[PDB]
Design a protein around this motif. Structure first.
Motif, PDB file in Angstrom:
ATOM      1  N   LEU A 120      18.516  12.447   4.559  1.00  0.00           N
ATOM      2  CA  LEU A 120      18.114  13.402   5.371  1.00  0.00           C
ATOM      3  C   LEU A 120      17.295  14.584   4.755  1.00  0.00           C
ATOM      4  CD1 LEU A 120      21.534  13.856   7.349  1.00  0.00           C
ATOM      5  CD2 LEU A 120      19.200  13.136   8.414  1.00  0.00           C
ATOM      6  N   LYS A 121      17.667  14.885   3.619  1.00  0.00           N
ATOM      7  CA  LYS A 121      17.075  15.857   2.575  1.00  0.00           C
ATOM      8  C   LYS A 121      15.707  15.455   2.399  1.00  0.00           C
ATOM      9  CE  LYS A 121      16.971  17.623  -2.209  1.00  0.00           C
ATOM     10  NZ  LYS A 121      16.262  16.565  -2.465  1.00  0.00           N
ATOM     11  N   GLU A 122      15.579  14.175   1.793  1.00  0.00           N
ATOM     12  CA  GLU A 122      14.286  13.629   1.333  1.00  0.00           C
ATOM     13  C   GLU A 122      13.244  13.599   2.292  1.00  0.00           C
ATOM     14  OE1 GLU A 122      14.854   9.882  -1.121  1.00  0.00           O
ATOM     15  OE2 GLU A 122      13.259   9.028   0.343  1.00  0.00           O
ATOM     16  N   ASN A 123      13.875  13.127   3.476  1.00  0.00           N
ATOM     17  CA  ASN A 123      12.766  13.048   4.573  1.00  0.00           C
ATOM     18  C   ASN A 123      12.215  14.165   5.047  1.00  0.00           C
ATOM     19  OD1 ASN A 123      13.658  10.330   4.315  1.00  0.00           O
ATOM     20  ND2 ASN A 123      14.884  10.190   6.279  1.00  0.00           N
ATOM     21  N   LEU A 124      12.797  15.464   5.060  1.00  0.00           N
ATOM     22  CA  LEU A 124      12.157  16.667   5.164  1.00  0.00           C
ATOM     23  C   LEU A 124      11.062  17.225   4.216  1.00  0.00           C
ATOM     24  CD1 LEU A 124      14.693  19.537   6.579  1.00  0.00           C
ATOM     25  CD2 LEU A 124      13.162  17.838   7.686  1.00  0.00           C
ATOM     26  N   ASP A 125      11.128  16.570   2.900  1.00  0.00           N
ATOM     27  CA  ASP A 125      10.074  17.014   1.747  1.00  0.00           C
ATOM     28  C   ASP A 125       8.824  16.346   1.941  1.00  0.00           C
ATOM     29  OD1 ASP A 125       9.618  16.701  -1.715  1.00  0.00           O
ATOM     30  OD2 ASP A 125       8.446  17.767  -0.204  1.00  0.00           O
ATOM     31  N   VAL A 126       8.025  16.733   3.230  1.00  0.00           N
ATOM     32  CA  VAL A 126       7.042  16.300   3.419  1.00  0.00           C
ATOM     33  C   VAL A 126       5.728  17.433   3.907  1.00  0.00           C
ATOM     34  CG1 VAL A 126       8.064  14.006   4.315  1.00  0.00           C
ATOM     35  CG2 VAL A 126       7.681  15.957   5.965  1.00  0.00           C
ATOM     36  N   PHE A 127       6.173  18.568   3.462  1.00  0.00           N
ATOM     37  CA  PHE A 127       5.246  19.608   3.714  1.00  0.00           C
ATOM     38  C   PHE A 127       4.257  20.138   2.589  1.00  0.00           C
ATOM     39  CE2 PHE A 127       6.543  19.990   8.045  1.00  0.00           C
ATOM     40  CZ  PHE A 127       8.027  19.587   8.243  1.00  0.00           C
ATOM     41  N   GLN A 149       9.025   9.021   2.013  1.00  0.00           N
ATOM     42  CA  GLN A 149       8.376  10.308   2.027  1.00  0.00           C
ATOM     43  C   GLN A 149       6.706   9.816   2.460  1.00  0.00           C
ATOM     44  OE1 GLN A 149       9.485  11.905  -1.842  1.00  0.00           O
ATOM     45  NE2 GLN A 149      10.512  13.501  -0.925  1.00  0.00           N
ATOM     46  N   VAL A 150       6.279   8.960   1.701  1.00  0.00           N
ATOM     47  CA  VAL A 150       4.988   8.619   1.982  1.00  0.00           C
ATOM     48  C   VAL A 150       4.640   8.232   3.531  1.00  0.00           C
ATOM     49  CG1 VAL A 150       3.151   6.951   1.637  1.00  0.00           C
ATOM     50  CG2 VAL A 150       4.288   8.296  -0.442  1.00  0.00           C
ATOM     51  N   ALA A 151       5.717   7.348   3.919  1.00  0.00           N
ATOM     52  CA  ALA A 151       5.547   6.876   5.548  1.00  0.00           C
ATOM     53  C   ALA A 151       5.589   8.231   6.349  1.00  0.00           C
ATOM     54  CB  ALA A 151       6.618   6.059   5.817  1.00  0.00           C
ATOM     55  N   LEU A 158       1.632   9.282  -6.249  1.00  0.00           N
ATOM     56  CA  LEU A 158       1.842  10.674  -5.737  1.00  0.00           C
ATOM     57  C   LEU A 158       3.173  11.024  -6.392  1.00  0.00           C
ATOM     58  CD1 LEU A 158       0.531  10.701  -2.255  1.00  0.00           C
ATOM     59  CD2 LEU A 158      -0.584  11.371  -4.424  1.00  0.00           C
ATOM     60  N   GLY A 159       4.129  10.195  -6.842  1.00  0.00           N
ATOM     61  CA  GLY A 159       5.562  10.480  -7.420  1.00  0.00           C
ATOM     62  C   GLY A 159       6.491  10.823  -6.159  1.00  0.00           C
ATOM     63  N   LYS A 160       6.311  10.262  -5.168  1.00  0.00           N
ATOM     64  CA  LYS A 160       7.086  10.347  -3.989  1.00  0.00           C
ATOM     65  C   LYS A 160       7.932   8.963  -3.489  1.00  0.00           C
ATOM     66  CE  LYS A 160       6.096  14.821  -3.647  1.00  0.00           C
ATOM     67  NZ  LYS A 160       6.951  15.789  -3.557  1.00  0.00           N
ATOM     68  N   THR A 161       8.767   9.145  -2.750  1.00  0.00           N
ATOM     69  CA  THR A 161       9.476   7.837  -2.402  1.00  0.00           C
ATOM     70  C   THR A 161       8.498   7.382  -1.213  1.00  0.00           C
ATOM     71  OG1 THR A 161      10.534   8.750  -0.502  1.00  0.00           O
ATOM     72  CG2 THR A 161      11.965   8.882  -2.595  1.00  0.00           C
ATOM     73  N   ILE A 206       0.907  -1.247  -0.117  1.00  0.00           N
ATOM     74  CA  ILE A 206       0.033   0.211  -0.025  1.00  0.00           C
ATOM     75  C   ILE A 206       0.743   1.419   0.042  1.00  0.00           C
ATOM     76  CG2 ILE A 206      -1.666   1.283   1.250  1.00  0.00           C
ATOM     77  CD1 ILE A 206      -3.039  -1.525   2.152  1.00  0.00           C
ATOM     78  N   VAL A 207       1.818   1.189   0.754  1.00  0.00           N
ATOM     79  CA  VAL A 207       2.896   2.342   0.837  1.00  0.00           C
ATOM     80  C   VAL A 207       3.424   2.699  -0.695  1.00  0.00           C
ATOM     81  CG1 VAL A 207       5.050   3.516   2.001  1.00  0.00           C
ATOM     82  CG2 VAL A 207       3.380   2.148   3.376  1.00  0.00           C
ATOM     83  N   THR A 208       3.960   1.742  -1.207  1.00  0.00           N
ATOM     84  CA  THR A 208       4.470   1.480  -2.383  1.00  0.00           C
ATOM     85  C   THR A 208       3.575   2.058  -3.429  1.00  0.00           C
ATOM     86  OG1 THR A 208       6.115  -0.396  -1.834  1.00  0.00           O
ATOM     87  CG2 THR A 208       5.405   0.095  -4.227  1.00  0.00           C
TER      88      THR A 208
END
Ligand SMILES: NC(=O)c1ccc[n+]([C@@H]2O[C@H](COP(=O)([O-])OP(=O)(O)OC[C@H]3O[C@@H](n4cnc5c(N)ncnc54)[C@H](OP(=O)(O)O)[C@@H]3O)[C@@H](O)[C@H]2O)c1
Length: 307
Positions: free
Chosen positions: A255-262, A232-234, A226-229, A218-220
């Motif tokens: 680290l950068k990727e994990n902040l792109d959740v806003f 990012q979705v988790a 959504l075009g995200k990793t 489901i996460v996948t």
């Protein structure tokens, strides 16, 4: 929109840096990349290294102390009232700061003073009321601007709330799509306690346990749509569920990727799909229970069935 307000009025940044198994260079890189909330613990063995990083970045004017939200945790061998303030003093010395923003009781289970790693013969009968009173003294002297708990079941949190003068600000618990904590979210919300999600990517447990989150079907699916990793979705899932998230990475790219959740969200038609994910807890705390030598005889007792 990038913080959760605590019951003290303080602003807790939505995404915190997980520091378990992190080295100084990665912590410094994280702050440069934009992390402000830093989740520490004495037991991680790296608070001194972190303090060197904070001293440099504050000294250079990169950030002011007030821009950072620093959490630490009281380890289980330090639960006795005499030891609680000594533990925080050591943490403050190591971190090279005058106060933490949040200080948590790391586990509801206690250990003998002489011990560090939990073993059956070192387990003791806890006295969370007395430990909390000592935490309250740290709050009253401004050593910890907010105080809270970690790994407390609905029942144990309720029991604390019934005796506490200072309401716990935070209960930090394992939370990710495979362990969603619906009931505890409800309780925390109703009492004004913030739930903070540790191991939001499925943890660092050996044997790639985290793939149950990062490669869940489901996460996948949601990530692809959504075009995200999947990370990012988790993480975005956790924010939308109303808890902070504490992702750890030693990689600058992650680290950068994990902040792109806003700047984007999971739409409701996809968000609802997470309800069908099989549930399992990864941080089981077998080391804090024992049939013969423990206070908690089983992990089911430790968690009051929340496992
Ligand atoms: N209160 C408690 O008892 C408790 C318990 C557990 C954790 N915590 C806190 O919660 C924090 C986070 O939990 P955690 O350390 O268990 O792990 P986590 O944040 O769930 O996941 C970390 C794992 O995922 C990898 N990862 C990170 N970002 C990724 C990405 N974008 N794509 C793919 N893989 C990625 C990391 O590897 P790399 O580093 O190799 O990238 C690491 O192996 C801890 O560091 C600690 O601060 C608290």
């Amino acid at each position: 929109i990038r913080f959760f307000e605590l019951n003290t009025g303080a602003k807790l940044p939505c995404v915190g840096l997980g520091t378990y198994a992190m080295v100084a260079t990665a912590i410094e890189q994280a702050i440069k990349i934009g992390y402000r909330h830093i989740d520490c613990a004495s037991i991680y063995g790296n608070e001194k290294e972190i303090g060197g990083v904070l001293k440099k970045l504050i000294g250079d004017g990169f950030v002011k102390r007030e821009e950072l939200f620093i959490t630490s945790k009281l380890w289980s061998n330090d639960h006795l009232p005499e030891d609680v303030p000594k533990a925080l003093e050591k943490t403050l010395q190591d971190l090279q700061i005058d106060y933490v923003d949040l200080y948590l009781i790391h586990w509801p289970a206690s250990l003998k003073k002489e011990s560090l790693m939990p073993t059956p013969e070192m387990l003791t009968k806890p006295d969370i009321t007395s430990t909390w009173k000592a935490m309250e003294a740290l709050y009253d002297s401004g050593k910890a601007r907010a105080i809270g708990v970690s790994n407390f079941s609905s029942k144990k949190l309720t029991d604390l709330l019934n005796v506490a003068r200072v309401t716990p600000a935070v209960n930090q618990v394992e939370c990710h799509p495979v362990w969603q904590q619906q009931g505890l979210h409800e309780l925390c919300k109703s009492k004004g306690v913030h739930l903070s999600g540790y191991s939001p990517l499925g943890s660092q447990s050996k044997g790639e346990v985290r793939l149950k989150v990062l490669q869940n079907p489901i996460v996948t699916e949601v990530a692809e749509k959504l075009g995200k990793t999947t990370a990012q979705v988790a993480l975005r899932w956790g924010l939308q569920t109303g808890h902070s998230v504490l992702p750890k990475s030693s990689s600058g790219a992650r680290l950068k990727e994990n902040l792109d959740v806003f700047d984007w969200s999971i739409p409701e038609d996809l968000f609802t799909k997470f309800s069908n994910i099989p549930q399992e807890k990864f941080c089981r705390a077998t080391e804090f229970a024992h049939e013969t030598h423990g206070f908690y005889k089983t992990i089911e007792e430790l968690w009051d069935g929340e496992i």
